[PDB]
Amino acid sequence: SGFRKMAFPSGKVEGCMVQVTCGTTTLNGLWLDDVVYCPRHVICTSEDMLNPNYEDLLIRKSNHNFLVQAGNVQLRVIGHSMQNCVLKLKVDTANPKTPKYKFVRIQPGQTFSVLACYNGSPSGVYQCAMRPNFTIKGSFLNGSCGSVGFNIDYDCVSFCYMHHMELPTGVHAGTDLEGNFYGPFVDRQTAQAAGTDTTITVNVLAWLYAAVINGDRWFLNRFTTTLNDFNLVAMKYNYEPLTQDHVDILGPLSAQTGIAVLDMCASLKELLQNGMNGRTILGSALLEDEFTPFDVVRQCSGVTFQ
Amino acid sequence: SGFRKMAFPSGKVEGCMVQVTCGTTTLNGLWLDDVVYCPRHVICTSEDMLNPNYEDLLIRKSNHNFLVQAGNVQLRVIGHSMQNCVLKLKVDTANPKTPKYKFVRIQPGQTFSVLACYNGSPSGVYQCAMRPNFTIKGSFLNGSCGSVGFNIDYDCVSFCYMHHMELPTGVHAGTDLEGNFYGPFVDRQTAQAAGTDTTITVNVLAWLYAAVINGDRWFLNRFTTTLNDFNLVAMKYNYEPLTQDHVDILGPLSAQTGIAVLDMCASLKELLQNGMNGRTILGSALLEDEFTPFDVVRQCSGVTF
Numbered sequence: 001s002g003f004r005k006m007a008f009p010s011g012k013v014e015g016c017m018v019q020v021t022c023g024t025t026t027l028n029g030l031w032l033d034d035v036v037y038c039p040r041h042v043i044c045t046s047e048d049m050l051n052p053n054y055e056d057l058l059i060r061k062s063n064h065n066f067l068v069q070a071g072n073v074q075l076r077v078i079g080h081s082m083q084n085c086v087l088k089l090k091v092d093t094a095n096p097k098t099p100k101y102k103f104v105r106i107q108p109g110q111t112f113s114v115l116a117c118y119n120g121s122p123s124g125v126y127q128c129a130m131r132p133n134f135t136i137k138g139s140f141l142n143g144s145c146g147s148v149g150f151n152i153d154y155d156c157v158s159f160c161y162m163h164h165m166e167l168p169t170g171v172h173a174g175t176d177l178e179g180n181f182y183g184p185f186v187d188r189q190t191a192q193a194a195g196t197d198t199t200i201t202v203n204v205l206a207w208l209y210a211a212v213i214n215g216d217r218w219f220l221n222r223f224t225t226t227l228n229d230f231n232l233v234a235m236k237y238n239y240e241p242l243t244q245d246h247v248d249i250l251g252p253l254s255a256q257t258g259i260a261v262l263d264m265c266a267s268l269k270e271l272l273q274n275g276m277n278g279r280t281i282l283g284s285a286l287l288e289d290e291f292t293p294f295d296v297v298r299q300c301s302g303v304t305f306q
Numbered sequence: 307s308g309f310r311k312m313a314f315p316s317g318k319v320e321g322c323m324v325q326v327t328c329g330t331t332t333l334n335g336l337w338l339d340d341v342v343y344c345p346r347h348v349i350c351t352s353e354d355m356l357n358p359n360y361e362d363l364l365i366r367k368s369n370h371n372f373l374v375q376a377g378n379v380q381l382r383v384i385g386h387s388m389q390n391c392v393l394k395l396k397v398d399t400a401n402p403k404t405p406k407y408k409f410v411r412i413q414p415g416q417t418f419s420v421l422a423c424y425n426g427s428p429s430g431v432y433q434c435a436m437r438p439n440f441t442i443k444g445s446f447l448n449g450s451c452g453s454v455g456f457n458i459d460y461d462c463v464s465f466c467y468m469h470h471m472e473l474p475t476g477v478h479a480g481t482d483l484e485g486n487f488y489g490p491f492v493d494r495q496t497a498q499a500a501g502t503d504t505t506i507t508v509n510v511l512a513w514l515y516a517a518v519i520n521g522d523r524w525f526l527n528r529f530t531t532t533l534n535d536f537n538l539v540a541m542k543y544n545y546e547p548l549t550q551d552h553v554d555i556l557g558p559l560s561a562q563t564g565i566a567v568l569d570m571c572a573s574l575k576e577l578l579q580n581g582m583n584g585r586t587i588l589g590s591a592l593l594e595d596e597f598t599p600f601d602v603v604r605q606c607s608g609v610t611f
């Protein structure tokens with residue numbers, strides 16, 4: 001019993017964190033096999049940040065301009081290349097702590113653990129979701145660039161995010177490990193803003209199923225809804241549209257609890273209308289949207305309480 | 307910017323988790339140096355749990371009855387002893403991954419990271435607080451016993467909790483690493499209940515300072531209060547008393563934000579008496595009490611390990 005915002009154990013990623021320095025700028029790098037991945041803006045001065053020409057800035061650098069430190073050991077850079085917004089520094093030592101890994105690009109609503117780092121050293125681990133507006137509501141200070149997001153389903157680390165920047169609202173933007181930004185963001189100091197964010201409906205439904213599995217049913221009602229009527233209501237509270245894919249994905253939780261997806265949708269519609277009336281669901285007075293259907297099945301028991 | 311419920315990096319603890327099997331029961335063990343620590347109830351059948359005599363159950367076991375697996379490697383148990391509610395299995399191999407560590411007993415209100423494990427395999431890491439009623443609101447399934455709680459101070463892991471049981475309300479009970487339970491709990495299948503819990507006042511104040519540091523100020527007001535008047539209001543709302551030690555501990559956050567501790571207490575008093583009025587603080591509609599003043603400073607300063 002219990003339901004917590006749970007991150008993956010971070011050890012497999014901690015053994016990959018290194019410090020990358022180029023001139024006066026120091027940030028984090030991810031050392032996997034003989035390559036260190038880091039944000040390409042490590043080669044920029046603060047003045048270069050408005051309209052940097054990364055190809056032009058990079059051509060002026062040699063391997064010895066990149067200082068990579070792993071623990072108290074300086075790695076030797078033997079090659080460098082840029083792939084989209086990520087810099088790949090070939091080093092002369094394969095990381096002996098390289099876990100089984102993959103690079104995965106995620107979709108909005110997906111969750112992942114972030115290992116926040118500074119100067120190549122891990123500071124903490126927390127759980128995030130890729131918001132519908134492609135930002136993440138992280139906790140990052142200056143020096144956190146290059147910190148990564150990941151999942152570890154089995155013993156394989158799927159790296160899905162590398163931190164690049166903080167937007168004016170205090171939310172964060174980054175790339176996949178191939179250097180492609182999530183969202184319409186660029187690694188430039190030009191005026192950029194997070195679009196209006198919305199609630200991840202499928203995740204709220206998953207979390208309501210988590211509450212039912214853990215023994216709470218106060219919020220259920222005798223009603224059902226069509227998918228279209230649910231979407232017309234939910235959009236009025238800035239909730240993401242629920243697709244038939246989302247309904248299918250919630251099938252297993254629906255079968256385990258005995259509550260049809262559209263019946264749980266009717267419960268959510270009522271919660272949006274009524275609020276919680278002094279009650280909580282899984283220790284929260286707000287509807288939680290940073291647990292996916294996959295997270296709920298992984299965290300919760302396979303036996304519903306009642 | 308941003309403020310998240312953040313756990314310590316778990317790698318140093320992951321390298322210590324092992325699987326301990328005794329008969330039909332499998333749970334987690336903590337392998338440090340040449341000793342594996344685990345809940346003593348690993349030696350019990352369901353019948354034994356009703357009223358166990360752990361000394362009597364243990365005397366019937368030999369070293370080979372304990373199967374300890376560190377990954378895909380079977381460790382050989384060369385001795386066994388009980389310390390309070392923890393079983394200590396001496397093994398022939400010192401854990402090469404043993405970090406610098408200490409065993410510390412924490413006080414209610416203190417937070418720690420839990421590395422939830424099943425079959426000696428870490429599954430998740432989360433941050434929680436030792437409640438004033440000595441339970442933890444964890445997330446644990448069957449097989450999670452022996453999962454540990456810890457903090458990191460510099461390069462040293464301070465182990466403070468070992469998971470033993472789940473109470474009927476779904477909250478959790480465990481011991482320090484010396485096997486002393488937190489709270490009035492016993493490792494036996496007998497009627498036990500979590501006592502009425504209270505809110506960790508100093509932690510709510512720390513989180514309000516975190517909200518201010520993050521640009522959330524709507525709850526600030528021109529008012530101050532005395533410590534005694536604040537504690538009268540705290541008692542009324544099932545909040546823990548705020549001591550002068552708590553006020554001193556919040557000094558640095560008070561100096562950084564310009565909001566004196568008693569000035570923040572008057573914000574907290576108004577929030578308790580009136581609610582949030584449809585507003586949120588750091589994305590929460592409830593007052594969060596599972597961040598200590600140290601956690602707030604650490605997260606807002608970027609301390610690494």
Ligand SMILES: O=C(Cc1cc(F)cc(F)c1)Nc1cncc2ccccc12
Binds near residue numbers: 166172187
């Ligand atoms: O955003 C940047 C630097 C940057 C600026 C830019 F215009 C484009 C970039 F790709 C990167 N750094 C930070 C990242 N995360 C959190 C932070 C918090 C405070 C101060 C800086 C933080």
Ligand SMILES: O=C(Cc1cc(F)cc(F)c1)Nc1cncc2ccccc12
Binds near residue numbers: 447451470471492495
């Ligand atoms: O509570 C126990 C076993 C136990 C029973 C007892 F009566 C006394 C004990 F010291 C230990 N194990 C569990 C721990 N955490 C979570 C669980 C969730 C579901 C089922 C069991 C869970």
